[PDB]
Nucleic acid binder design. Structure first.
Ligand SMILES: [Mg+2]
Ligand SMILES: [Mg+2]
Ligand SMILES: [Mg+2]
Ligand SMILES: [Mg+2]
Ligand SMILES: [Mg+2]
Ligand SMILES: [Mg+2]
Ligand SMILES: [Mg+2]
Ligand SMILES: [Mg+2]
Ligand SMILES: [Mg+2]
Ligand SMILES: [Mg+2]
Ligand SMILES: [Mg+2]
Ligand SMILES: [Mg+2]
Ligand SMILES: [Mg+2]
Ligand SMILES: [Mg+2]
Ligand SMILES: [Mg+2]
Ligand SMILES: [Mg+2]
Ligand SMILES: [Mg+2]
Ligand SMILES: [Mg+2]
Ligand SMILES: [Mg+2]
Ligand SMILES: [Mg+2]
Ligand SMILES: [Mg+2]
Ligand SMILES: [Mg+2]
Ligand SMILES: [Mg+2]
Ligand SMILES: [Mg+2]
Ligand SMILES: [Mg+2]
Ligand SMILES: [Mg+2]
Ligand SMILES: [Mg+2]
Ligand SMILES: [Mg+2]
Ligand SMILES: [Mg+2]
Ligand SMILES: [Mg+2]
Ligand SMILES: [Mg+2]
Ligand SMILES: [Mg+2]
Ligand SMILES: [Mg+2]
Ligand SMILES: [Mg+2]
Ligand SMILES: [Mg+2]
Ligand SMILES: [Mg+2]
Ligand SMILES: [Mg+2]
Ligand SMILES: [Mg+2]
Ligand SMILES: [Mg+2]
Ligand SMILES: [Mg+2]
Ligand SMILES: [Mg+2]
Ligand SMILES: [Mg+2]
Ligand SMILES: [Mg+2]
Ligand SMILES: [Mg+2]
Ligand SMILES: [Mg+2]
Ligand SMILES: [Mg+2]
Ligand SMILES: [Mg+2]
Ligand SMILES: [Mg+2]
Ligand SMILES: [Mg+2]
Ligand SMILES: [Mg+2]
Ligand SMILES: [Mg+2]
Ligand SMILES: [Mg+2]
Ligand SMILES: [Mg+2]
Lengths: 262, 205, 151
RNA sequence: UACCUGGUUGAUCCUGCCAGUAGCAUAUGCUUGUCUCAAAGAUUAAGCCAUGCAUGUCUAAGUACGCACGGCCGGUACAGUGAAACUGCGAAUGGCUCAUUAAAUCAGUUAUGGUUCCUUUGGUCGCUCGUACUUGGAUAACUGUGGUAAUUCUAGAGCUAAUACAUGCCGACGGGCGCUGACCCCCUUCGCGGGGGGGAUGCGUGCAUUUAUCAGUGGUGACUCUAGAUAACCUCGGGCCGAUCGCACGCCCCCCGUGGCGGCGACGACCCAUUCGAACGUCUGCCCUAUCAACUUUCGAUGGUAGUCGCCGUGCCUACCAUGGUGACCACGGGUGACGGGGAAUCAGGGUUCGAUUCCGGAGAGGGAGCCUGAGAAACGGCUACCACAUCCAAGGAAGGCAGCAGGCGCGCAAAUU
RNA sequence: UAAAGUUGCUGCAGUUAAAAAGCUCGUAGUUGGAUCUCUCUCGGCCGAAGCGUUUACUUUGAAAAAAUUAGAGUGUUCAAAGCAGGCCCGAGCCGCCUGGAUACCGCAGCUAGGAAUAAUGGAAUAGGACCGCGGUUCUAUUUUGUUG
RNA sequence: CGCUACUACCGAUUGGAUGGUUUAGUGAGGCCCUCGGAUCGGCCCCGCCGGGGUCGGCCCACGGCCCUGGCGGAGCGCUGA
């Protein structure tokens, strides 16, 4: 190509959007923004495919141009805006609040939250650097840059940001025994407690996590997001607490639910 | 046009390779900026990304640094004496990085005489002008004279630099790239490097 | 003297050797402070690099290079270029149809720093990846271990 | 479904092929009632094309004195809709084809601590001590006069705008800090001398740019990293530090003024970070061929030093040097009815063959080459030449590129509606 | 493409049916006889650091585009397909429940256990290991309440 | 050896042919550098029309110092494109 690409084939779209094959040739290409193309959820997909508010792409635009949708407290009229992990979506017309959290299957879930909880979010510290005049700067996973952070905050930590002022309230350090969620890989969407960290100089580090039921797994250090201190999360969790079931016990649960239905 | 690609080259084994695409814009090259000595003439070049490169075609002044004294001053450029890469560059008086040039000594002499309050570059005949006399022989108080006399303890310069100051021209080396940034900056040669380049210049003659 | 063999003056760019001093400190010793660095990954700096006087901008310890990427090993086969040698890497390639292997080799031209001396043909060398230093050189010698016949 | 059968002899047992058998995919012949999906000018010609269409865009928010329409006051700048034109953005995506291409493309795996990056998102934007209650000259649309056989050709004259093109202040502005420092004090000294302060007058100062020196907030496995200090520089083909637009309009004064203050947005901009990338690198991996065994190095082949050029790393190029580099583990050369993979057919277990073709990379726009603009193109529904074709002409000139959708000729065994 | 065990790695033949070089030497290639049953220190039993003489092998783990194939669910009227769907209504006029799994992905490159098999390594002119004791030269930090 | 036909081989010789390389000699066009200067402005020197201040002899007239709007002519004067 001679420059940036502007389209996205429907079969080449991320598979956690759960698009069907026969609807069209194209998929909504996410706009540039805080989150990556392969790790976001476009506003149109959430607004018509998940919530069933709109039937076509035109109705999504008609909803958005009435300034009804807010993302992290700010009105977004773009229908392909990239919304990502730990983002807050507010609809004041219906008085609804949602937080984008992966379910145990690695897909963004429709997770309703209290309006009190919708005032803050958690962010992962990606970079720490000193700028001009010796002023510290902290860069999070969602492209936020914050000046004068707490001197004890380092990389791979978690900070709580108040969405109205955009300022740090408190933080969680990356230590063994804390609660974390996996944000990528084969264990995406799982929740557990950090057991130990393996350091490989010049390469990727590996972190071992164990869930509430006692199942153990491992990921890379870049795929770990610290949620809470100890066993207590600082956010509300979806229907599944982050425990991944096997296919046999999913079948057993489904059969038990069917038997008790009716 | 001028292409600086790698696929027109032979392989490591020695066999030649057939290209699979034509010349691309991002592989281009441009004619050299042969910077001479004369009244300033600089042309700007629009480069990749929309940025600018300053293509110096003629230069006559630049700021050079006396490292031992940490004295940086803006001085005119007089002549080109040595060039490690090629001697044709000396004959045509081309200003490139790492070439040895001759610069004027007056601002450095002024700073030295205003700092240590000692003669420098003066003939043994002791002819003087009243401005220089009041610069060197000014009436100072006890405290200021105490500082100047203490400074006179460290006032000592090698014979090579002293002879160059007597000649009125210093030897300097250019550290910037005139064809890329549009300015000719450098440092004054001194120490073992000065002896090395003096030996090279003498052997060239 | 022995170092100065080119038309241009050979200097370590990060060391200022023209600092003026008193006449008492000049008499003592004209010993330039050496510039060296730790390359990381557990490799130690040879004493010949710290105490040496050679000038090499492509040396991993006293030059302007960065070691990042793959760490490989080879056997020295040719030492005939200036500050660069040719090593041979041997391996086996698996052929699925016959369930067997075939012997294959590759040749690498790598940069050898002057800090490594007494390097002979047939000894093991550990090299690290860096930016392209020339048309065919992308690796720098990090460690030298002698052959089994060392006495 | 791990499978066989006929044929050499007067008859027999073998070797061994030929023929038989079943899929699959191209063509063709005969035949054809109902419904659901559904390939389709790849193979020969990346051969040649009539005609039509395929890329254009305005919000309250850059510029409206077109009555072209339109409501009230009637000097009481501009009510509103708004053609045209200037300005801004996009046109580098998409769609088509498979000619070239054999460590090349491409796949997995790593790196950029060796670069650039429109836009989105976040951070900075009184940090500089040196007409502003708003500065200047033009150009379209429009109105008039024209030329040529001919084009999305344009020439002269009269008017008028800006977020086009330029030029430029105030304010914060009280000072602070680095050097220079006449002079004035306070201790010790009999006194010189040894100390400790204050200081008028001068120069410099913020972020980016270039060079030199010094010390050692935060980070990496590792910086010649980030930040700090000092001396200077800072391109006239010139870095930033707002002379821009809309909507609601209000609080305050010794006041009716030069009246002071104030809320949401839109546009723009130097520099960081982010997003989308792109571009160079690392390791391993590809079909036949020796009736291809030595190849590369005059004209860079392998390495070293210094430069030039480039967005950066590098024989990318230049100068001066060393004689290197590759090869029966198949180099070099040649062929391919060779774009590479994800995949497809057949298959007991192994395997054999195919992959032009809707997804991901690459290349090309009749063949070469060179460029303008732009963040991004060596772009072809952009320009400039040569080579081959080819259209109109009043012979003076002017205009070309369907391997985009249909469609036409040719080619062929071989493929659809202008 | 199978049939073709008529290209044979699995898995073919070479006395007479096609076939072993006239004979020997020999480099590269291939192949190769037995044998050998975690650690001090520094910090809070674990933490850091050296591990392993190293590999090959095997078993784990991580990262690995979708589509296709294999495969779970689901009466497209069945099926090829698709990713959908189901339940009560006194009507929910705040409708409720639920899916969009999983497996495989060669070679090469990362990760952690195993120690049989197969390579490779040590002390022989002992300038070989382990525990100590004297002689000399060269530089850095701290303590003499600070400063030379 | 004598009849009847086909394919593949040599080989007097030169045609219709194209395709691919290169030695030398020319070489369109763009780009870069050094020149060049058709033309278009701005600043000075005069002159007459016009508006603000002030100064002078002063009484509704006319000059001085600055600005200010236009118009006409010079200077191979200066400068910018
Ligand atoms: Mg395209
Ligand atoms: Mg989009
Ligand atoms: Mg090509
Ligand atoms: Mg097999
Ligand atoms: Mg018979
Ligand atoms: Mg048959
Ligand atoms: Mg019917
Ligand atoms: Mg065709
Ligand atoms: Mg074709
Ligand atoms: Mg086709
Ligand atoms: Mg089209
Ligand atoms: Mg326009
Ligand atoms: Mg554009
Ligand atoms: Mg189409
Ligand atoms: Mg790759
Ligand atoms: Mg780079
Ligand atoms: Mg950006
Ligand atoms: Mg006009
Ligand atoms: Mg502008
Ligand atoms: Mg710094
Ligand atoms: Mg270089
Ligand atoms: Mg070189
Ligand atoms: Mg081909
Ligand atoms: Mg193929
Ligand atoms: Mg099989
Ligand atoms: Mg079979
Ligand atoms: Mg394919
Ligand atoms: Mg293909
Ligand atoms: Mg073909
Ligand atoms: Mg494609
Ligand atoms: Mg192209
Ligand atoms: Mg074409
Ligand atoms: Mg064609
Ligand atoms: Mg063409
Ligand atoms: Mg643009
Ligand atoms: Mg082109
Ligand atoms: Mg076309
Ligand atoms: Mg196109
Ligand atoms: Mg067509
Ligand atoms: Mg057409
Ligand atoms: Mg057909
Ligand atoms: Mg036909
Ligand atoms: Mg077969
Ligand atoms: Mg069989
Ligand atoms: Mg068998
Ligand atoms: Mg047989
Ligand atoms: Mg026989
Ligand atoms: Mg025999
Ligand atoms: Mg042998
Ligand atoms: Mg054995
Ligand atoms: Mg994949
Ligand atoms: Mg797949
Ligand atoms: Mg030319």
């Amino acid at each position: 190509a001679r420059g940036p690409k502007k389209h996205l084939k429907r079969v080449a779209a991320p598979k956690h959007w759960m698009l069907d094959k026969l609807t069209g040739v194209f998929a909504p290409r996410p706009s540039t923004g805080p989150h990556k193309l392969r790790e976001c959820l476009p506003l149109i997909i959430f607004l018509r495919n998940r919530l069933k508010y709109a039937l076509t792409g035109d109705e999504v635009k008609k909803i958005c141009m009435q300034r009804f949708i807010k993302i992290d407290g700010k009105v977004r009229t773009d229908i392909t805006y990239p919304a990502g992990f730990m983002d807050v979506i507010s609809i004041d017309k219906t008085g609804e609040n949602f937080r984008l959290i992966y379910d145990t299957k690695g897909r963004f879930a429709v997770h309703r939250i209290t309006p009190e909880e919708a005032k803050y979010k958690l962010c992962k510290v990606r970079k720490i650097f000193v700028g001009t005049k010796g002023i510290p700067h902290l860069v999070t996973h969602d492209a936020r840059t914050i000046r004068y952070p707490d001197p004890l905050i380092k990389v791979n930590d978690t900070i709580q940001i108040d969405l109205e002022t955009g300022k740090i309230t408190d933080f969680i350090k990356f230590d063994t025994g804390n609660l974390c969620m996996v944000t990528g890989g084969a264990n995406l969407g799982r929740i557990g407690v950090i057991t130990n960290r393996e350091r490989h100089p010049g390469s990727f580090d590996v972190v071992h996590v164990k869930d509430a039921n006692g199942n153990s797994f491992a990921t890379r250090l870049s795929n770990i997001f610290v949620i809470g201190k100890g066993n207590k999360p600082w956010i509300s969790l979806p229907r599944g607490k982050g425990i991944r079931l096997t296919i046999a016990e999913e079948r057993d649960k489904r059969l038990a639910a069917k038997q008790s239905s009716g | 046009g001028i292409s600086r690609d790698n696929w027109h080259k032979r392989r490591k084994t020695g066999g030649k390779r057939k290209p699979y695409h034509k010349k691309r814009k991002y592989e281009l090259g441009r004619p050299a900026a042969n910077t001479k000595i004369g009244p300033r003439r600089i042309h700007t070049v629009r480069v990749r990304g929309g940025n600018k490169k300053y293509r110096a075609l003629r230069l006559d002044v630049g700021n050079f640094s006396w490292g031992s004294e940490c004295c940086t001053r803006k001085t005119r450029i007089i002549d080109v004496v040595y060039n490690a890469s090629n001697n044709e560059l000396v004959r045509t008086k081309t200003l490139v990085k790492n070439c040895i040039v001759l610069i004027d000594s007056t601002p450095y002499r002024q700073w030295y005489e205003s700092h240590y309050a000692l003669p420098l570059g003066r003939k043994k005949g002791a002819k003087l002008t009243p401005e220089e006399e009041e610069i060197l022989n000014k009436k100072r108080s006890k405290k200021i004279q105490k500082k100047y006399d203490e400074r006179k303890k460290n006032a000592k310069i090698s014979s090579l630099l002293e002879e160059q100051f007597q000649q009125g021209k210093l030897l300097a080396c250019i550290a910037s790239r005139p064809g890329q940034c549009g300015r000719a900056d450098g440092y004054v040669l001194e120490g073992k490097e000065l002896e090395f380049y003096l030996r090279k210049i003498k052997a060239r003659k | 003297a022995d170092i100065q063999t080119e038309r241009a003056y050979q200097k370590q760019p990060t060391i200022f050797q023209n600092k003026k001093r008193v006449l008492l400190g000049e008499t003592g010793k004209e010993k330039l402070p050496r510039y060296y660095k730790n390359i990381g990954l557990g490799f130690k700096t040879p004493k010949e690099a710290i105490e040496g006087t050679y000038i090499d901008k492509k040396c991993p310890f006293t030059g302007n290079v960065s070691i990042r990427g793959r760490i490989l090993s080879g056997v020295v086969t040719k030492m005939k270029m200036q500050r660069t040698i040719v090593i041979r890497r041997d391996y086996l390639h698996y052929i699925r149809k016959y369930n067997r292997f075939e012997k294959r080799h590759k040749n690498m031209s790598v940069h050898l720093s002057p800090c490594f001396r007494d390097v002979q043909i047939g000894d093991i060398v550990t090299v690290g990846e860096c930016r392209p230093l020339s048309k065919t050189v992308r690796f720098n010698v990090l460690k030298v271990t002698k052959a089994a016949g060392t006495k």
